[PDB]
Symmetry: C4
């Protein structure tokens, strides 16, 4: 065997089947409308159509060999897959899109390729590929815009073909509206035919209108309907363009809107230009160093038993340098990684101060912190990455003259990325295995006596 | 009896009255402006107008026979309904729209059907039908787009009629702007008249402008006002189109935006392509198997005493296979169905692990789980649908060497849809009837000894 | 005083000063550009300009006599108000807009009314009136759309005047682009002048372009700049139109989106058409009876000491029929009115059932409820409006064989609007005055014995 | 060293390098396409190009001398900065944009300035400056709109240059579509050349289309592609304009939407016009006095150890007049400034009333309050700014006949801005230093006895 739709093989086949479906959606109508296209390159159209039909057949086979999830397990029983396929509307659409209507080439002649129009009924495969690509691609907005542009181009191409067909029905050159006479040297070339039809279609759907006005009632009606199709469908698609660009700007726009609200508040309250500059510097840091997004709000949509792995694969850089995690229990790190709230501190920010509520443990992910003196400048100890502080005031200790108080003040030399671990959480998670707690308050007593 | 507006009969009548109202809103102005329309098909217009008026009268009768809610009860007293009708502005509008202005046909002649313009004053019924359909239809966006297209078409039709009337007032063919001379063979046909007027209207309201420029001051003024009506009203309607397409994409766009934020985080943090593929697979599963929507956020707008029924009608498939619910008390299932949080687990995800906080009971809705050994591969027990686990570590038990600990580790073979029932909730809800609890810890002791 | 800007007198004056400001913003540029406008109606323009200037002077006086809030109190000291006025930029703008530039009529002649262009510098007053109207009017969206239309019209009018002025500078009729020769009988009329200039302006700003193309470099540059002004500013304004219509649809669109999510869930889960019809009926009820909006989310932006008054003025209809409120303490009703959560129940919905957690007291605002038998049909007692139930299981009672249990089952005959009062809240709020509690458990014992 | 990108020097250099990048992005294509531009002002183009290249070199030097943050510290080691530069793609782009392609002037002649097209590869610097300006400027929306207008102008300019180049390739005047013959006196001027090309570009990108239709297939194709570029890219940019105006209106629109929901509720519930006027007055006050924004929601994105400084720099005006803060401990004010919830009370609003739950302490930021008698009018004490009340009922006091009760009723004479400090918070924060608490209940006893 089976294909496992989640796999890469299924996605690759989705591409390989979208190619004929897109080809069919573009060219069947073109060949049906522009007769010279069908006739001049008939030897190539036959090859391409037969290849497309072969790929359609192989796609039907793949649909027979693609497993589905019952009880969460991939069904691998062949006949079960055949039944699941045939019971779905997709099998009906596939049989309809693979009906050998090409036999009508013997009746209607080689000049009627619209018999292959049923081949469009595999559009679903194409759309599936798109909805898969949009999910799996690393450039979701580039692909989304390319998809919208493809839809625009297909719509304009189809409307060009429709215009040319209507000109044919009315008669080429019978009036100033229809496509001019084919017998003209310049206006008889297939290139000119298609490109002028596309020009007309673009002017009509984009509602520019710089085309000869209608002459007949059918022409007036078609032009009204087509200008309305233009207005509505092009507003739809080119406003989807707008929404895609909006969601492209979503993060940056939200960040900038927050900054603007802050600046409005500061200018209204006449906040000192010192503090205004400090705030602007904080936000410039958040942007430049790519910290505007908070991983919590993003990863909250992941499963906890997958977001856990995510956090591990991101923070194993530092949670191996820490003494508590991955050293004593070697598994405890998972119990708290999904609750280590990542904070960022500016240069000179006092994370801790003597005589404060010690309700948070900190793990230094990045940055240089200092166990300073209360004078403000004298740096007693420099804590680099992997260090952990703020854990002594969490625990119950014998001989602690300072209970629930910070034993020292910790300031940040530079921008520090820390993991604030709350006291309640450390309490709750160390209950399972105190084999790490013993050396934890080993460190605790050792630092509390000195 | 009375009609009970909530019923299907009332909605069917809403359709049956919207038909004449829509007919009146489309055709009265057309016949008033295009005199040949009124004259040539007068025998049909008379029949249709009289049928419309009869339906208007029957709608007034229905309004006299439609109950309203006082004290939440449907008023069935006839005279009370007559008073409620006559006291509402709707009765005034109905009498105004049913005034026999057709008598003016004897004074103004058969060429003045705008006397029936008062018939438009039942627009409310039409709009009511729409606002009912949008609520009750299964295709809300299809109907909404059809409604907007109907508004566009009606506006363009009315503007075409207005253009033709203005041409008539100025005189057909008196200058290049107005509709050409009626005496022309081609430009005198009612078909050509209406269709060219519609063409002009479309070019003006869509602001394409490929029409002969005005000549007189009245023409310049009307064209300015009409181009502005075009800009404003068509932006309104065709931007409502945009918002409707947006809300069509709302679920998919939110899902894809979450996926994009996740992928941005993973690529920025250089998350391993293993875990990136796992996350993409999780999201592909959520989409393909239609799990992107969380029933909680959707059904939270339902009444609890209706959302309860909803959850029951959805989850009675599994809550009959469970041993606790619908078996001992047979009513307890409602006390917890509105708090069974549905979770989804990937293949191989450890739902439970030995030596963890047993604070959640799980009911396997769909999927195969395994009571494995801690080695990781040896599957002791396979739990299929209807099974419940994680309930032993909830309860107070005699002789439990493992208190508040998982007696075994449960992993998911495939994608498991479970119902996580919190410990606090099971505690709170079993307090009412311990007739099920006794066999609950029957199972508890039986599994805790073996 | 003083005038007290919050008062109605200040708003009326805002209108009376917006009239000259709007007049000045519309007509000064018109008279400056269309010389015939200035000249032909000079006797009227002089009167209107002098009246506008008098009103400007009276507006300056009002600004001297309008109090401001210092320490939250309206300043009534005259000289303090004069200082507050003169210290503001508004005084500078007012003196600038009232500078007697009309004296230049003696130097530049009566054909130069753009000397009155400084009169536009009172635009602020106009805008203030708008921002006041939008706040105080009952039709905020009608006024907002009228304001946007006024901006569109003013922009188009100004661009028409600019086009005519540029034609004058280049010379009327010197090329096909500029306004045609004034000496023409038809193209020399002030009506034709202004209306064709407005036509050109509309075609340019709405970017229709059906105007003679530029000839000179200045004309090309102006047309480029004006088409870009068109694109940008008209997108701005006519997209503000879109956002205004969106916020017009905001409530209805949110309601309908909730209904659509519900219907999607129900159709996906194959919810029985019984329950689907019940849900659709619930939502039809919510809409038809105007219950889609929840007063909590709306009134949460009001002050509690004003939202309290709001809730009182709305619910004094029923909280006078209740026995506890406004009867014993006569003031207790305010302590709980801001926490009476309004619920709606469908016909037949069991609000209470025997043997359930009695943690909510209910006050029947509207609707008929029944104290039924557990059989389901036998109605023991019918509770109409003003009745209160679910209070016995809240209180501590002697001789209650049923503790924390519902003494009877309450069902809703029809759609009941109730006030669910939580047990914790009744406990917390009755602590202040048990003078009502005594008769509360009077009723309690009386019903618990029978 | 180093430059410290957060500093003002780096931003100034960002401007000084954006000037050549913008110059290059505007003029290289212009000179490449309009040959007369390159030739006539070659002496000036050479100077400007060499100055631009010198500034590019100095920008490369700056990039070598700009520190980056490792461990949150600004790297000042020269060679480390050289490595960080050369290891980034920016160094590749800078070397590519500074390659001396001007040497090709000796081969291709002075008429080929597109060899300087590589100079566009420093676009990043320009964009960086923009993203810095948008952050640091006080007019974020003005700058954003200016940036979008710059993008529009650059796109139109580039498309004008492209049109002129295509006309050159096809041949000037070979058909009606291309730019006319250069040999024409009027259509040969560089001014006319560029300005008509810009006119064509504006008509095409804004999709007005009032230009001669294409003649050749290449012209038709280019016009289709360019009209589509117009539609898509101009919708993008001029809808970004819409979103920028939306976020300009965001605060005012949210405020007005809240007011509209309130007014809809009041008119639907038939709220008395007294209370409707009171609510409208409250909202008029909120707007006029600039209180629609709540500093909590804005400043919650700031760091707590920066939002603290913000609140201090804003509220030190009053927290120096208070007796508790900045007087006894002199540091306690920071422990509670981030939890002082700012409330606003209308004139006559009873903040406190005798016999109520004293769970909030109030600090009068602005406004006159009264310790009144319960009669309602007799004002015992007038509390101005700096005063604090509601603190007696917070504390545990000996001899308090009124426990957890308000000792008096406080009403607001005028609009009072207060700081509501919750009881729990005062309890929690005074635990650290009771040196202020002693005089706190000094005041407490002193007022409780009298
Ligand atoms: N007092 C003290 N604290 C230190 C030293 N080195 C690291 N620290 C950390 O500084 C922290 C300050 O807050 P805590 O008292 O909670 O915990 C303290 C220790 O974790 C040291 O040498 N002396
Ligand atoms: N230990 C054990 N647990 C089982 C077995 N079969 C099912 N389970 C479930 O596995 C669950 C693991 O978590 P709990 O200990 O809370 O509850 C356990 C039982 O509900 C079994 O055979 N042995
Ligand atoms: N048992 C009983 N309850 C009644 C009667 N009339 C009204 N009620 C209300 O029905 C309510 C059901 O819930 P509670 O027991 O909390 O409170 C009960 C009473 O408030 C009655 O006649 N008998
Ligand atoms: N009773 C009384 N209260 C006063 C007086 N002056 C100020 N107050 C304040 O009024 C407040 C009312 O609420 P509290 O009793 O909590 O605290 C009271 C005091 O803080 C006074 O003279 N008498
Ligand atoms: Na156009
Ligand atoms: Na157009
Ligand atoms: Na046009």
């Amino acid at each position: 065997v089976v294909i496992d739709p989640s796999g890469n093989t299924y996605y690759n086949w989705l591409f390989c089947i979208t190619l004929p479906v897109m080809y069919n959606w573009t060219m069947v109508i073109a060949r049906a409308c522009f007769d010279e296209l069908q006739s001049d390159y008939l030897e190539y159209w036959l090859i391409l159509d037969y290849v497309s039909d072969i790929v359609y057949l192989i796609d039907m086979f793949v649909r027979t060999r693609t497993g589905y999830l019952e009880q969460g397990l991939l069904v691998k029983e062949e006949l079960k897959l055949i039944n699941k396929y045939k019971s779905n509307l997709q099998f009906k659409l596939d049989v309809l899109s693979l009906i050998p209507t090409d036999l009508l080439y013997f009746k209607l002649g080689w000049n009627y390729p619209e018999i292959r129009l049923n081949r469009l009924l595999r559009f679903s495969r194409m759309f599936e590929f798109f909805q898969r690509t949009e999910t799996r691609t690393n450039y979701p907005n580039i692909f989304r815009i390319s998809n919208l542009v493809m839809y625009i181009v297909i719509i304009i191409h189809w409307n060009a073909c429709v215009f040319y067909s209507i000109s044919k029905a009315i008669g080429f050159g019978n009036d100033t509206w229809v496509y001019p006479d084919i017998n003209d040297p310049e206006f008889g070339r297939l290139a000119r035919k298609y490109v002028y039809s596309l020009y007309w279609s673009t002017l009509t759907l984009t509602t520019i209108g710089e085309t000869p006005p209608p002459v007949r009632d059918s022409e007036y009606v078609f032009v009204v309907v087509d200008f309305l199709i233009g207005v509505l469908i092009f507003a739809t698609i080119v406003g989807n363009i707008g929404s895609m660009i909006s969601n492209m700007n979503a993060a940056r726009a939200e960040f900038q809107a927050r900054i603007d609200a802050i600046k409005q508040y500061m200018h209204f309250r006449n906040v000192s230009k010192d503090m205004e500059k400090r705030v602007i510097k904080w936000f410039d840091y958040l942007w430049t160093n790519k910290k505007t997004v908070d991983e919590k709000e993003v990863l909250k949509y992941l499963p906890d038993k997958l977001r856990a792995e995510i956090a591990i694969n991101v923070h194993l850089d530092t949670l191996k340098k820490v003494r508590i995690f991955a050293d004593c229990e070697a598994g405890l790190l998972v119990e708290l990684v999904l609750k280590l709230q990542p904070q960022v501190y500016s240069p000179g920010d006092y994370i801790c101060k003597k005589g404060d509520i010690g309700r948070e443990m900190y793990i230094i992910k990045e940055g240089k912190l200092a166990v300073v003196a209360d004078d403000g400048v004298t740096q007693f100890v420099v804590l680099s990455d992997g260090s952990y502080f703020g854990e002594i005031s969490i625990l119950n200790i014998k001989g602690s003259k300072a209970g629930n108080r910070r034993t020292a003040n910790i300031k940040s030399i530079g921008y520090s990325d820390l993991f604030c671990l709350s006291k309640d959480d450390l309490m709750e998670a160390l209950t399972e295995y105190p084999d790490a707690k013993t050396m934890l308050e080993e460190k605790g007593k050792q630092i509390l006596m000195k």
